[PDB]
């Protein structure tokens, strides 16, 4: 490659659009196939102008829980306000000095 390091795949964020009515819980699945144990997973929100807001993070209204399968995580907003409409995504960041970040594709709430 150009890079002497092993390439890795970005996490996937599902479903590509989640529709839930007010007061309820909504839940995305961030599926990240790690290769190291040295990463963190972030849950972001894009405003209409593409500005980022970090909601939650694993390890630590907005919750992130790590499934026992080793692969998946669930991002869950509890009691969903409608000023919560819009755009949420996940990204993994490596912990090495030369940090690398891979972002998931984009979903709509």
């Amino acid at each position: 490659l150009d890079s002497p390091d092993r390439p890795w795949n970005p996490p996937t964020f599902s479903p590509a659009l989640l529709v839930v009515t007010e007061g309820d819980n909504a839940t995305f699945t961030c599926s990240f196939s790690n290769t190291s144990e040295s990463f963190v997973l972030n849950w972001y929100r894009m405003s209409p102008s593409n500005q980022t807001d970090k909601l939650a993070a694993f390890p630590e209204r907005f919750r992130v829980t790590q499934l026992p399968n080793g692969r998946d995580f669930h991002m869950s907003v509890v009691r969903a306000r409608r000023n919560d409409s819009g755009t949420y995504l996940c990204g993994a960041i490596s912990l090495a000095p030369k940090a690398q970040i891979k972002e998931s594709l984009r979903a709509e709430l």
Partner: antibody, heavy 113, light 110 residues
Framework: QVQLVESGGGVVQPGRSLRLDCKAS????????MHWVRQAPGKGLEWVAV????????YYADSVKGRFTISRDNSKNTLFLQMNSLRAEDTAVYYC??????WGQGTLVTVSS | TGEIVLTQSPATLSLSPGERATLSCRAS??????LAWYQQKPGQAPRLLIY???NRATGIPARFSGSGSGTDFTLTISSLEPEDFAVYYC?????????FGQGTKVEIKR
């Protein structure tokens, strides 16, 4: 808790050979491209060699090409530098480092009679 | 294959704690943004500060910043801490062989 440890340093006579080891811990070694970098006493940093996480590619500095050979064993987490035809001006601290910048603490190689 | 020569200036920057430090690296040919900066203190391994011209390495304080592209690069320390007086090296990762600059010493002015 990530650690790079070089071993094999020491004294070696000119014209002879010496092999360095670098043992990695705390990382998945076979994901990381690996480098050797050297520093002669009172001088600047000098890149030595790189090996793909793969072993599929190796590159070398002009000053060591053909005399030194970099290799790795991804099943024992170790990186090697085989150094042949050593000369006085190869005297240096030798560091290993990952491509994502974890650094060992270095080992001194002295080429002398 | 060519050797990309990295020229750092000045050789020595003499400054007081709290002042702003500006270090330069010029490449003999374009390097795009594949330019890293390292700090080395005596008897210690180098340590990454800035990679790809302008990203801070993990845990590097905000007073360190990098900028530039092509052949002209700058490392800025906005306010020098006493820990910051040290030698700084630039390194290009655009081509093989990889090359370092010859280093700039940041010393206490007196």
């Amino acid at each position: 808790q990530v650690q790079l440890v070089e071993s094999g340093g020491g004294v070696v006579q000119p014209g002879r050979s010496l092999r360095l080891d670098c043992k990695a811990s705390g990382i998945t070694f076979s994901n990381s491209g690996m480098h050797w970098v050297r520093q002669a006493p009172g001088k600047g940093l000098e890149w030595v060699a790189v090996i793909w996480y793969d072993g599929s590619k190796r590159y070398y500095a002009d000053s060591v090409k053909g005399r030194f050979t970099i290799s790795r064993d991804n099943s024992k987490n170790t990186l090697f530098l085989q150094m042949n035809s050593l000369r006085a001006e190869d005297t240096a601290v030798y560091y290993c480092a990952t491509n994502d910048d974890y650094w060992g603490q270095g080992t001194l190689v002295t080429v002398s009679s | 294959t060519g050797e990309i020569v990295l020229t750092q200036s000045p050789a020595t920057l003499s400054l007081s704690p709290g002042e702003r430090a500006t270090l330069s690296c010029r490449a003999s040919q374009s390097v795009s943004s594949y330019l890293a900066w390292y700090q080395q203190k005596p008897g210690q391994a180098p340590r990454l500060l800035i990679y790809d011209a302008s990203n801070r390495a993990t845990g590097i304080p905000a007073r360190f910043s990098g900028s530039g592209s092509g052949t002209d690069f700058t490392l800025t320390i906005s306010s020098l801490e006493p820990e910051d007086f040290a030698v700084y090296y630039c390194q290009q990762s655009s081509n093989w062989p990889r090359t370092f600059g010859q280093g700039t010493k940041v010393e206490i002015k007196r």
